[PDB]
Amino acid sequence: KWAEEFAASGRGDQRSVQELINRQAEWSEEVKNYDAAAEMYIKAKKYDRAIAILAKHQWWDKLIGVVRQLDKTDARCLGMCAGHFRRAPHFAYAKETLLKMDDTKGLITLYVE
C-alpha cells in the first residue's frame, strides 16, 4: 500500500517508484502470485518478465495482454509471442503479431503456421 503510495505520488515527497513497484512485483513472485506479478511487472516495465510469466504459466490471455501492453514500440512481445502463440493454440496472435506491421509476404510462412 505505502510502497505504491510513494510509487504514484508519495506522501509529500517522492521515494523510489520502481524500487517499491518491483518490491511488490517480486514479492508477488515470492508468494507465487504470478498473474499479479506480471500485472506489477507491466507496472515495473518488466513486460519481458511479465510476458515470460504469462507464456510459461499458460496465461495466453494475459500473454497477448502484455503483447498489447508492451506494444509495437517495444515490439519484443509481438515476435516472441508469435513464438509463444505457436506453442499456444492461438494462431490468430502469431498471424496478427506478424500482420501488425504487414508481412503478408512473410505470412506465407505465418499462414502455413
Up-side HSE of residue 107: CA atoms within 13 Å toward CB? 15
CA distance 45 to 21: 10
CA 90 vs CA 21, 65, 72, 78, 103: distances in Å = 31, 13, 19, 13, 18
The closest of 86, 38, 32 to 66, measured between CA atoms, is 38
CA distance 16 to 8: 10
The closest of 47, 36, 106 to 72, measured between CA atoms, is 47
Q: How many CB atoms lie within 10 A of CB 77?
A: 26
Determined by cryo-EM
**105, exposed or middle or buried, with CB in 10 Å at 0-12, 13-18, 19+?**
exposed
* ∠ Cα 26 65 70 (to 5°): 75
CA distance 112 to 56: 25
What DSSP character marks residue 55?
H
CB–CB of 2/23 below 8 Å? Answer: no
In the numeric block, which cell numbers belong to residue 36?
Answer: 499479479
**21, exposed or middle or buried, with CB in 10 Å at 0-12, 13-18, 19+?**
buried
Identity at 92, one-letter amino acid code: A
